[PDB]
Amino acid sequence: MPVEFSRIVRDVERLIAVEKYSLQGVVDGDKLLVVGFSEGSVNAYLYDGGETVKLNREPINSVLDPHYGVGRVILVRDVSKGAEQHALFKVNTSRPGEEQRLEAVKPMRILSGVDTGEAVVFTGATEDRVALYALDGGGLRELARLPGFGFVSDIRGDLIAGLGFFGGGRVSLFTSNLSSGGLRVFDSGEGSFSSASISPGMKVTAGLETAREARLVTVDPRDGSVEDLELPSKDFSSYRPTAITWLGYLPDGRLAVVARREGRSAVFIDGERVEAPQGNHGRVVLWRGKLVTSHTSLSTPPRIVSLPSGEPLLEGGLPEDLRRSIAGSRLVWVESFDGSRVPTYVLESGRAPTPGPTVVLVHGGPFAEDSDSWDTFAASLAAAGFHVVMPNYRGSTGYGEEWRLKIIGDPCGGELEDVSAAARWARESGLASELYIMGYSYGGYMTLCALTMKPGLFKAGVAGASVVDWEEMYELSDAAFRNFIEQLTGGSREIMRSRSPINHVDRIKEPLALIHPQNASRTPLKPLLRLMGELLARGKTFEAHIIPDAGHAINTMEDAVKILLPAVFFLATQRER
Amino acid sequence: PVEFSRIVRDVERLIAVEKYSLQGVVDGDKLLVVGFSEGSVNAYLYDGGETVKLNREPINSVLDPHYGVGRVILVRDVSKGAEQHALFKVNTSRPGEEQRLEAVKPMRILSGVDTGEAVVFTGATRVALYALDGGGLRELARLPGFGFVSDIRGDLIAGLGFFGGGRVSLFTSNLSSGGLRVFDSGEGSFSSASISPGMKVTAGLETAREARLVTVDPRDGSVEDLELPSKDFSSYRPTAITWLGYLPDGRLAVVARREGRSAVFIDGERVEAPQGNHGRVVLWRGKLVTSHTSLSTPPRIVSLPSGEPLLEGGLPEDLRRSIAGSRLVWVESFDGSRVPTYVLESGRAPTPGPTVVLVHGGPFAEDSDSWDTFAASLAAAGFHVVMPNYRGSTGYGEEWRLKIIGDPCGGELEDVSAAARWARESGLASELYIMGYSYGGYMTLCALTMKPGLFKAGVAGASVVDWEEMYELSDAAFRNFIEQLTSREIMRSRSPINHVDRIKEPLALIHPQNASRTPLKPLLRLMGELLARGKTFEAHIIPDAAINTMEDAVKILLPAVFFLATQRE
């Protein structure tokens, strides 16, 4: 059967075009601040009275977390054509579309930020350092240098609270001061801190993710004491979460917590379970006295909903035919090499037979999760007639500290076996007639890792924005990613070499498709050029697609088409062979 | 917003549109036509409006039938993409019933004529001229090279041969005794041949400057110019003779060419024909019929002199209106010589509008008024197409072809650049893009280096990046061509890999992954140099990359069109 290219393009472009919204906070006069992919690009909008107002001109990457009622929004715009060197732009909410560049900040990798209306506190990674900056009337000030990736969580008064990846894959809590600066790190011996919000008593309420569970703890920044937080309702404690998505104090003092287990989240106010649509939820805001959150699911693109009715305020609509191309989704537990149960989401295509063509779609990160959340790539594969298997290999989030840290020191090892077991499960369970592997960033590294370490398991592979050589990538990384590479490999350069797919090209026996941004910082192109030379010299058949002016974060419809369409075409072509 | 799916939908139809060629008249006054679509070839009978398929499985070609014979000889590949073929006979009264001609072993069938009594064909295994009759197969002569049967009248067989010397020779043979008589044209090259009722050989003699209609006496090899009753043909001043043949009533039909377009002549008198290029001419039910193609018209069967299509592939109302009209312009170049340039205008672009200079490869080739899927796809996507016959092109005299010798991406680049400046000066181009494949891709890269600012973006396909590297890396034949094409000093200066610093516009690379004539290793070096110098570029490397199928278009054409569509924002 011939590949139906034109339908694939039409399906792919419609799935990319559907509006996707992100909830950021409440500004001005009870205006919802939302980030949305609408009209083919990423923009920032004010929502109020059933209408949206565009705040930015040219597409953005994100905005900083606003304090309630501040009369401005701080845009974050990549000004390096995908290299993730960002700049900050202020937009007065009273004059949307009028941007003022914050010229006191030089282009750096902006990692997080909070705007109190009086000061703009953020974390940025330059070539030599990750630091916690503050921008006010007295100029730009560095408050502290951070030993790796750090993100601002909350600011109440003079106290700043955040989260830091400062060692061995565990997340530490940190505090600083707007007036005096400095840094104080809070490490937990039970697990990692997940979210953080400063209480009215100037404490730090934080989520603590231990080996197999998660709970709320109170951290006194004065002496570092930690105690379990008790809530006036017991719904949260009996919910027994394994991960905490986000928490924060509402302006009326109530504590909102979004926690999750088995790829689905729940909303709690002062411990009480609030009804929310099935799936995954973002931050919770108080808007005109009502609770608003974001909602997403494997069949529902990210949307803005009110609680507890679950009724949408902003959502993109999918055409019925695309809705039908996803027959359903389920979570199954795949047994891996050492007897661990790998939580795996399966997306059953309504346009494939059973057994039928199946793509194992490996998520990136690796500190990320295949959850019941919208995946544009997974939707395109179901629309093109592929079942999608999404394994949360070890190193994934959402299933406890123990499962997440198992990857530390073992890239392309135990987690690769998890991917293989899910693939073998698909065929052995009667779901898959043939097996393909596909992934981007770290998922693209896994594809190369799979085709080199386990030839013959899959029929063909798609590696997008992949890691090819840990050594060269480390030499081409900034302060943050160099530290991140060190934690992932456990400091071992021997792990950096033996676990690099570039050093195992001889083993490849399957057709390979390479897709790569031309000027991405996280995953540089120069090692990929070396990989293609290796493939050619060793007589391996491959195809490569290098997309320019795009990096890790795509914020236009055209670039998203150009990095996804080659993958679907390649797999559809392979299916007829 | 770029409508990627609208571009792909249009490309599918331009690839899938049924194209027709005219083979002759068979059985009871019925046209024999060949239909080609998506690399699939079929043979049909046309009489009344409905077409009757003659074959069961797709074929490779058919042999040339004599007027009115009651059968067709099909040529079909013995395997998938195998150069060796088999012969199948089909009675025109029982279509769909194929009888394999088992007396002919599988071989490379080169040409053939069916008289209704004997099947005479050339085939390569040696290369020989064969005859198949009731008594079986006979080898009439062994040919010193690739040869092709042109015509049979009585026992006299006439054909054309690549028998050495660089020129095409005329040869005769006998259907009874066999044998081989070769006629060298000296300063000339035969292009077509038909045997006159008086058993002389009328042939087209293409030369350096102007083509000649000559008579060859097969008895003594005397060559003399043929003067026709009407003088329209001589005054037409053709540079090539596409095809000629005697109609059943003894009149001589001639299709000749000049400046990328052809004209139809009957005993020297010109017949009105739709603008473009034409195939063979037949007399069918007292009317003249031929095939017609142009930059705006896929190959089709038309009636003369009205030009009314008898058989043409369908194109939707939108796509048809998007591909709107072609013209020939004479672009004044840098040296005073005029560059013959064809222009295909888009109905989806304004004037001035986005315009792509589509550089042909070879370089010994020609941009004529013929159907081109690339140009049509560009026009369908909202681009005017400018196709210049830069020095080195064929079809405009030996002097113009030889002027490129010793000046790679030098003199001929100016002709391409002059064509781009012409598109601007004449008010057609609002923004300029350059695009080419094989040698045309080499032109694109060298143009972006030596003429930055001229074009807004470039697409380079199957290009040559470094002649110095190419010469030693390539085989004898290609290396010999490189020597005549480019002094090693010129080889390095004309190689665009050494001028990557000068590139200033986005560049799209489309390259085969496993091509011996265009290796991938040099292009990987170019991509490394582009990245090290901060040059914006897009790259598409596809294994096993002539657009016959949609699959071919997806690999080689869609990335170019997608790139240009987003480059215009």
Residue numbers in the entry:
A (entry chain A): 5 to 581
B (entry chain B): 6 to 130, 133 to 493, 496 to 554, 557 to 580
Task: Give verbatim excerpts from the published study on this entry.
Acylpeptide hydrolase (APEH) or acylaminoacyl‐peptidase (AAP) is a serine hydrolase that regulates protein metabolism. It can also bind to and process unusual substrates, acting as a detoxifier. The most prominent physiological function of APEH is the removal of N‐acetylated amino acids from the N‐terminus of oligopeptides and proteins (Perrier et al., 2005) thereby exerting crucial control over the proteasomal degradation of damaged and misfolded proteins (Adibekian et al., 2011; Hoernstein et al., 2023; Hwang et al., 2010; Palmieri et al., 2011; Sandomenico et al., 2021; Shimizu et al., 2003; Shimizu et al., 2004; Tangri et al., 2021). Their active site is sequestered in an inner pocket that is formed between the catalytic hydrolase domain and a propeller domain that caps it.
To further probe the catalytic significance of the shift of the oxyanion loop, we produced PhAPEH and ApAPEH. Not only is the shape and position of the oxyanion loop unchanged by complex formation in these archaeal variants, but it is also locked in a conformation that is very similar to its forward shifted state in pAPEH; thus, these systems can be used as functional models of the enzyme with a more restricted and confined catalytic site. We found that the archaeal variants are quite selective toward their specific substrate Ac‐Leu‐pNA, not being able to cleave Ac‐Ala‐pNA, while pAPEH processes both almost instantaneously. Furthermore, neither ApAPEH nor PhAPEH is inhibited by meropenem, the bulky carbapenem antibiotic that is a potent inhibitor of pAPEH (Kiss‐Szemán, Stráner, et al., 2022). Attempts at producing a co‐crystal structure of ApAPEH and meropenem were also unsuccessful—using the same protocol that afforded co‐crystals of ApAPEH with peptide‐like chloromethyl ketone inhibitor (Menyhárd et al., 2015; see Data S1, Chapter II: “Substrate/inhibitor preference of APEH from Aeropyrum pernix and Pyrococcus horikoshii”). Conversely, it seems that archaeal variants of APEH contain a pre‐formed reactive center that requires no adjustment upon ligand binding. However, no such shift is caused by the binding of CMK‐derivatives by the archaeal variants of the enzyme. In fact, both the size and the invariability of the active site of ApAPEH (or ApAAP) and PhAPEH (or PhAAP) are closer to those of the “regular” serine hydrolases than to those of pAPEH. Here, we established that this same Pro is also the most likely inducer of the backward shift and flexibility of the oxyanion‐loop, and also demonstrated that archaeal variants that carry Val at this position do not show the same promiscuity (Chapter II: Substrate/inhibitor preference of APEH from Aeropyrum pernix and Pyrococcus horikoshii).
